[PDB]
Amino acid sequence: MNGTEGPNFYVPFSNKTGVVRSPFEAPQYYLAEPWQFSMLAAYMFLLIMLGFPINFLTLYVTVQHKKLRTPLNYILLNLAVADLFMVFGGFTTTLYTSLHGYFVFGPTGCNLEGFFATLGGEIALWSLVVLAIERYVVVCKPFGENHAIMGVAFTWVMALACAAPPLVGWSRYIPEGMQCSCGIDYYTPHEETNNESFVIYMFVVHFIIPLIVIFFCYGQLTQKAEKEVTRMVIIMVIAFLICWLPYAGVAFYIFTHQGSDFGPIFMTIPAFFAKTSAVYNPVIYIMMNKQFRNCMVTTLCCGKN
Amino acid sequence: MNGTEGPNFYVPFSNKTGVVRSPFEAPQYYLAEPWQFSMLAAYMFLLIMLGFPINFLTLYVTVQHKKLRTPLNYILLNLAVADLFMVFGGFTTTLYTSLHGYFVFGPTGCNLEGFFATLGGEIALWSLVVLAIERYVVVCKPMSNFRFGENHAIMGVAFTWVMALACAAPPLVGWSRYIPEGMQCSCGIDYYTPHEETNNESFVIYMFVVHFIIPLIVIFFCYGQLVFTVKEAAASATTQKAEKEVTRMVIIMVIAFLICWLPYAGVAFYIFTHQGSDFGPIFMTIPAFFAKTSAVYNPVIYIMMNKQFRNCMVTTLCCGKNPSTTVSKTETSQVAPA
Numbered sequence A: 001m002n003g004t005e006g007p008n009f010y011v012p013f014s015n016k017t018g019v020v021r022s023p024f025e026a027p028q029y030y031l032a033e034p035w036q037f038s039m040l041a042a043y044m045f046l047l048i049m050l051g052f053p054i055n056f057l058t059l060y061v062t063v064q065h066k067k068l069r070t071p072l073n074y075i076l077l078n079l080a081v082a083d084l085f086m087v088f089g090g091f092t093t094t095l096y097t098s099l100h101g102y103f104v105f106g107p108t109g110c111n112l113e114g115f116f117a118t119l120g121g122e123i124a125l126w127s128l129v130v131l132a133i134e135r136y137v138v139v140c141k142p143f144g145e146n147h148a149i150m151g152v153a154f155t156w157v158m159a160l161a162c163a164a165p166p167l168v169g170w171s172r173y174i175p176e177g178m179q180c181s182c183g184i185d186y187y188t189p190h191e192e193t194n195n196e197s198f199v200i201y202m203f204v205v206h207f208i209i210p211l212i213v214i215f216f217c218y219g220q221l222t223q224k225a226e227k228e229v230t231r232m233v234i235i236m237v238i239a240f241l242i243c244w245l246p247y248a249g250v251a252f253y254i255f256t257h258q259g260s261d262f263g264p265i266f267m268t269i270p271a272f273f274a275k276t277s278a279v280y281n282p283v284i285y286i287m288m289n290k291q292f293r294n295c296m297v298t299t300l301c302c303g304k305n
Numbered sequence B: 001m002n003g004t005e006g007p008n009f010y011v012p013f014s015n016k017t018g019v020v021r022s023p024f025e026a027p028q029y030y031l032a033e034p035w036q037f038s039m040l041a042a043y044m045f046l047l048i049m050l051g052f053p054i055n056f057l058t059l060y061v062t063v064q065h066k067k068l069r070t071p072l073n074y075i076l077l078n079l080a081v082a083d084l085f086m087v088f089g090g091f092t093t094t095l096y097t098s099l100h101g102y103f104v105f106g107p108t109g110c111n112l113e114g115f116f117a118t119l120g121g122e123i124a125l126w127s128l129v130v131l132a133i134e135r136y137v138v139v140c141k142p143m144s145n146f147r148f149g150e151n152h153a154i155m156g157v158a159f160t161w162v163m164a165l166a167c168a169a170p171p172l173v174g175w176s177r178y179i180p181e182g183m184q185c186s187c188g189i190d191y192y193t194p195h196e197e198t199n200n201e202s203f204v205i206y207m208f209v210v211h212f213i214i215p216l217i218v219i220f221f222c223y224g225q226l227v228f229t230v231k232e233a234a235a236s237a238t239t240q241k242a243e244k245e246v247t248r249m250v251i252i253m254v255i256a257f258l259i260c261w262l263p264y265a266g267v268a269f270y271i272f273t274h275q276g277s278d279f280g281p282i283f284m285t286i287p288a289f290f291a292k293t294s295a296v297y298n299p300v301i302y303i304m305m306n307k308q309f310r311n312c313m314v315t316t317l318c319c320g321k322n323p324s325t326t327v328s329k330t331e332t333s334q335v336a337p338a
């Protein structure tokens, strides 16, 4: 076998050498060297020490600033809060997992690792949706503390309809690559949870569609200021595709070819790269939005414009 | 002329267009697009956001935990401060400079930016020598009965500061000088102009000899000695392999150092030789700026390879509890000598 399956895992390595051990009981240092694991744990340490200040600052500013209540400001606060969950709920476990070369925290840790990452990306994928329409309405012209809170609520509803099932009984979060990150069970059919039907679902209801919607809405496209809130949204959407296509693409190749001879590094890259999703959004924000950039500076200098 | 030489600078651009302008009076947008200056400003902003906490937590942890006092634990508190000094002393001035397209605060803004980047780079280099030594005295069977105390640790720290100031202070006093580099938002040692009357051709030879080759010779010869025992393998104050974990670490900090300062040192030596030659702004911006990650990686390695210190910041961050010999002044921090 080009792989080693367990009742709850799947290590991309042949146990013909009788060296493959569970990602839950012993380090996976027989997959890659101990330097690449501490390298991952360093990356995770950085993502943590940036994802926190940057998302929380963002959170503290829109909350602190009285005149910061645009749907954009709402969606961007959302991401800042989802990015914080990613960081504490998820990044916490993935940091300590790498520091041990396996899931020391057990499955509760694998679930923590995957739920917040999927919730993370899905809230982004869904908030990018709540934004695309707003731009078909304030630019293609067919809001506020009213409707933005429904889009913001809706993003959690939808994201949760994706990150929540593998926790209860539809699909399962399972260690990927160097067995340090967890994601949807693309690897096995597992008749018991038919993650074969969940992947066909997640890929359509939480990937394909949400995207085509962000597309035709875009294809079907103060009065001069909306061009920069647009160019931002456009950019936000593009940066998301860069985090998730490398992943989602790799994730699908595997779902269809369940059994191939791929290695651990194969999915470790698109998967660990994708975690910048927790930090990248609030950077585009300062960059192309004179309103926030200035208001953030005011939160820092305590008044000196 | 391939470059406009001023009494204070050297813009790597040609003024046969009159488009060049003093990096102390106007933005250097003519040297390259505005968005590139925006990326430097973003980049510096992200470094200041990381270098601060990472370095400050590293700092706050060592002080609070009363038994975290080995030469290593010491020499690494030194780096958190030097890095914080970079973050505030230099980095604050490098981000304002990028945001505005030139050195608005002028020559002192160039001095603070260049001084604290050199000071921090050298606080680093020399600390690697006090540590490369520390390693020897412990691993390759040295002395006869000796063991390091806190006292020895402070002398190495005091030494690194004198050796870093010995390199960074002169350009503020008249020996060589801090001049803007690349896109003109970073400041370093003058390798560009002869300026025979501040002794430029002189200092650069001194700095590269005394503040680069030598410490590297020593650090490399010590590492050559620590092959008698600790070859290359190492697979926290617990047993025999507690030192092998420190040595393997101290041996990584040297590799990181290289990757960080070689590019800069390399492209900087090129210039000193090929002065007046045709190079662009971008040329030096990259090594220079990448090198600025120097204010951030040391504690990253520390809290990654030191099982004792890590659990210690995890103890600090978790208010005292935590769900390896206990040294954090949190968890039976009582003495255990003899």
Ligand SMILES: *[C@@H]1O[C@H](CO)[C@@H](O[C@@H]2O[C@H](CO)[C@@H](O[C@@H]3O[C@H](CO)[C@@H](O)[C@H](O)[C@@H]3O)[C@H](O)[C@H]2NC(C)=O)[C@H](O)[C@H]1NC(C)=O
Pocket (backbone or CB within 6 Å): A004, A005, A006, A015, A017, A018, A019, A020, A021, A022
């Ligand atoms: C991969 O194939 C090897 C065959 O070489 C399997 O080896 C077996 O590994 C399990 C744990 O993965 C061992 O069980 C445990 O043994 C220890 C003592 O060594 C005991 O304390 C535990 O309670 C448990 O019984 C088993 O001894 C070992 N047997 C062999 C062949 O050495 C291995 O299970 C396979 N890995 C997987 C799970 O895919």
Ligand SMILES: *[C@@H]1O[C@H](CO)[C@@H](O[C@@H]2O[C@H](CO)[C@@H](O)[C@H](O)[C@H]2NC(C)=O)[C@H](O)[C@H]1NC(C)=O
Pocket (backbone or CB within 6 Å): A001, A002, A259, A260, A261, A262
């Ligand atoms: C082990 O991995 C190899 C390589 O991915 C698999 O071989 C391929 O199998 C597909 C059919 O699913 C063929 O179309 C390819 O031509 C094969 N490639 C080769 C081997 O040249 C193989 O099926 C895998 N073994 C298992 C466990 O199914």
Ligand SMILES: *[C@@H]1O[C@H](CO)[C@@H](O[C@@H]2O[C@H](CO)[C@@H](O)[C@H](O)[C@H]2NC(C)=O)[C@H](O)[C@H]1NC(C)=O
Pocket (backbone or CB within 6 Å): B004, B005, B006, B015, B017, B018, B019, B020, B021, B022
């Ligand atoms: C490049 O050549 C131009 C050609 O004049 C210089 O421009 C003059 O600079 C002085 C001093 O800053 C100004 O007072 C003049 O107004 C400029 N001349 C004009 C109006 O064209 C420029 O200084 C040279 N580049 C540098 C700064 O070295």
Ligand SMILES: *[C@@H]1O[C@H](CO)[C@@H](O[C@@H]2O[C@H](CO)[C@@H](O)[C@H](O)[C@H]2NC(C)=O)[C@H](O)[C@H]1NC(C)=O
Pocket (backbone or CB within 6 Å): B001, B002, B003, B274, B276, B277, B278, B279
């Ligand atoms: C202007 O720049 C040119 C090119 O960068 C300098 O000319 C160099 O002269 C050497 C002499 O050995 C030639 O071999 C090179 O081809 C030239 N450039 C290089 C190093 O590639 C010239 O000296 C500069 N002019 C001044 C004096 O500033």
Ligand SMILES: *C/C=C(C)/C=C\C=C(C)\C=C\C1=C(C)CCCC1(C)C
Pocket (backbone or CB within 6 Å): A113, A114, A117, A118, A120, A121, A122, A125, A181, A182, A183, A184, A202, A203, A206, A207, A244, A247, A248, A251, A271, A272, A274, A275
């Ligand atoms: C680092 C941990 C990771 C990447 C775990 C899980 C990720 C997912 C379940 C992602 C799902 C998707 C998202 C977030 C956006 C594009 C579509 C998708 C299904 C690949």
Ligand SMILES: *C/C=C(C)/C=C\C=C(C)\C=C\C1=C(C)CCCC1(C)C
Pocket (backbone or CB within 6 Å): B113, B114, B117, B118, B120, B121, B122, B125, B186, B187, B188, B189, B207, B208, B211, B212, B261, B264, B265, B268, B288, B289, B291, B292
């Ligand atoms: C971002 C600003 C910078 C990097 C300014 C100045 C840097 C130096 C003077 C560096 C000197 C050196 C160090 C720190 C270590 C290797 C040798 C060296 C001379 C290149």
Ligand SMILES: [Hg+2]
Pocket (backbone or CB within 6 Å): A131, A132, A133, A135, A136, A214, A217, A218, A219, A221
């Ligand atoms: Hg749109």
Ligand SMILES: [Hg+2]
Pocket (backbone or CB within 6 Å): A239, A240, A242, A243, A276, A277, A280
């Ligand atoms: Hg990205």
Ligand SMILES: [Hg+2]
Pocket (backbone or CB within 6 Å): A065, A067, A291, A294, A295, A298
């Ligand atoms: Hg404001």
Ligand SMILES: [Hg+2]
Pocket (backbone or CB within 6 Å): B131, B132, B133, B135, B136, B219, B222, B223, B224, B226
């Ligand atoms: Hg050494």
Ligand SMILES: [Hg+2]
Pocket (backbone or CB within 6 Å): B256, B257, B259, B260, B261, B290, B291, B293, B294, B297
């Ligand atoms: Hg570096």
Ligand SMILES: [Hg+2]
Pocket (backbone or CB within 6 Å): B308, B309, B311, B312, B315, B326, B327, B328
């Ligand atoms: Hg500790």
Ligand SMILES: [Zn+2]
Pocket (backbone or CB within 6 Å): A007, A008, A192
């Ligand atoms: Zn099962």
Ligand SMILES: [Zn+2]
Pocket (backbone or CB within 6 Å): A189, A196, A255, A256, A258
């Ligand atoms: Zn299938």
Ligand SMILES: [Zn+2]
Pocket (backbone or CB within 6 Å): B193, B194, B201, B275
């Ligand atoms: Zn010369």
Ligand SMILES: [Zn+2]
Pocket (backbone or CB within 6 Å): A099, B307, B310, B311
């Ligand atoms: Zn640990």
